[PDB]
Design a protein around this ligand. Sequence first.
Ligand SMILES: NC(=[NH2+])NC[C@H]1Cc2ccccc2[C@@H]1NC(=O)C(=O)Nc1ccc(Cl)c(F)c1
Ligand SMILES: *[C@@H]1O[C@H](CO)[C@@H](O)[C@H](O)[C@H]1NC(C)=O
Ligand SMILES: *[C@@H]1O[C@H](CO)[C@@H](O)[C@H](O)[C@H]1NC(C)=O
Ligand SMILES: *[C@@H]1O[C@H](CO)[C@@H](O)[C@H](O)[C@H]1NC(C)=O
Ligand SMILES: *[C@@H]1O[C@H](CO)[C@@H](O)[C@H](O)[C@H]1NC(C)=O
Ligand SMILES: *[C@@H]1O[C@H](CO)[C@@H](O)[C@H](O)[C@H]1NC(C)=O
Ligand SMILES: *[C@@H]1O[C@H](CO)[C@@H](O)[C@H](O)[C@H]1NC(C)=O
Ligand SMILES: *[C@@H]1O[C@H](CO)[C@@H](O)[C@H](O)[C@H]1NC(C)=O
Ligand SMILES: *[C@@H]1O[C@H](CO)[C@@H](O)[C@H](O)[C@H]1NC(C)=O
Length: 339
Amino acid sequence: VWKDADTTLFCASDAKAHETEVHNVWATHACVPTDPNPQEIHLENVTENFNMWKNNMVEQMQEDVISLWDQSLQPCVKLTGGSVIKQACPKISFDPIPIHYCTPAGYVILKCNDKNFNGTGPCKNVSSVQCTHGIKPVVSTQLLLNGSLAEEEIIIRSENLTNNAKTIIVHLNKSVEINCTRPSNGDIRKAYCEINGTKWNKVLKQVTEKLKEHFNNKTIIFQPPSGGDLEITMHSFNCRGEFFYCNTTQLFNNTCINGTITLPCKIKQIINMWQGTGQAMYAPPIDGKINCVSNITGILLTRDGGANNTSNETFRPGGGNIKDNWRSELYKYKVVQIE
Ligand SMILES: NC(=[NH2+])NC[C@H]1Cc2ccccc2[C@@H]1NC(=O)C(=O)Nc1ccc(Cl)c(F)c1
Ligand SMILES: *[C@@H]1O[C@H](CO)[C@@H](O)[C@H](O)[C@H]1NC(C)=O
Ligand SMILES: *[C@@H]1O[C@H](CO)[C@@H](O)[C@H](O)[C@H]1NC(C)=O
Ligand SMILES: *[C@@H]1O[C@H](CO)[C@@H](O)[C@H](O)[C@H]1NC(C)=O
Ligand SMILES: *[C@@H]1O[C@H](CO)[C@@H](O)[C@H](O)[C@H]1NC(C)=O
Ligand SMILES: *[C@@H]1O[C@H](CO)[C@@H](O)[C@H](O)[C@H]1NC(C)=O
Ligand SMILES: *[C@@H]1O[C@H](CO)[C@@H](O)[C@H](O)[C@H]1NC(C)=O
Ligand SMILES: *[C@@H]1O[C@H](CO)[C@@H](O)[C@H](O)[C@H]1NC(C)=O
Ligand SMILES: *[C@@H]1O[C@H](CO)[C@@H](O)[C@H](O)[C@H]1NC(C)=O
């Protein structure tokens, strides 16, 4: 006998105590070991309702990542709400590790196993677990990096598609590599990312096909972001502690719907913080080759307003609300209380 409930969750990880990598240190102090023999239980003949858009798990993971980042990536200058904070800022070691979220006694996590599950409504194949799978707290905009894949078809997610103010999460079923590089000795801040364009265009082809199923077979057009700050108009993310800002115009160019695509990037020290309402200044990049190779696993889209009287829909890449990054992995779970 169970009902929807929110409770305070705990985490589990495979953090190495000896590692100075800042996620390992965090999890070492803040999580417990993973259960080497987790036990999923499948529930016959039970339908359960889910709502990825209103899920307290999402608020708890966000709290964790804000706390991880507050203790490990301190800027030299923090400008948060009418104040200024000069403070030390050494270069650190940085590479996200999977984190599991688990329920305490009296509770359990239900997991939606339906393979087309769009994140809202009823779920036919529901099971129960002590813990979610391990989720890398990857902070980025525009493209979801190193997450999980949709198991069958590309899946379109949104709290309400008819409403264009609401972000769309596209869940890929086949990842595409993005190889990102700040080459060593010029412009220390200069970088690029490379993507196999044959792969990428075949995927963007399939996404347009999918979007037409939700938008009445209208014509699907991709465009670069309108305005907003740099963290949004570009694919922004963190690579070995460096904040990379990448121009995705070539990713979102409806024409090619074939070779290596080279996105130009710039490392920035001054940034608008994702944790909200404030800019921070970080230290200049470490020397040497700086490289992250990442799996693109989702896309974040914002749809254009005012296209009702045409046969077009226009999608621009978006993001900015990091809560949605965690929703893209947490959509398949809801906490319930047992009695
Ligand atoms: N204005 C701010 N200051 N923070 C507020 C967030 C919330 C929000 C909602 C919609 C659109 C943009 C934003 C702001 N998000 C960002 O500042 C942001 O996401 N920046 C950020 C910063 C660093 C990295 Cl690696 C990254 F991926 C993102
Ligand atoms: C991904 O989904 C599309 C439909 O959206 C489907 O046509 C295709 O077969 C899937 N690709 C993979 C890798 O299974
Ligand atoms: C998800 O499925 C539900 C009904 O099962 C439907 O109401 C909703 O429109 C779907 N969401 C999206 C974004 O496709
Ligand atoms: C979805 O958005 C549309 C457009 O704003 C709006 O008419 C409607 O109220 C929303 N749907 C729901 C279920 O609230
Ligand atoms: C990624 O980028 C560069 C080539 O531009 C190279 O040094 C590195 O080995 C590449 N890695 C992969 C996995 O392609
Ligand atoms: C790029 O993609 C094409 C088609 O997906 C593939 O056949 C080719 O091997 C790839 N090129 C690279 C990066 O080796
Ligand atoms: C899109 O096109 C096919 C016919 O070409 C049709 O079967 C399907 O109903 C259409 N989908 C819509 C409008 O959602
Ligand atoms: C991205 O690069 C293109 C180069 O064609 C440029 O025109 C565009 O304004 C750039 N976007 C941003 C965010 O500066
Ligand atoms: C994605 O995963 C790869 C392999 O673990 C890692 O090298 C890279 O740093 C990750 N990407 C980001 C943006 O954190």
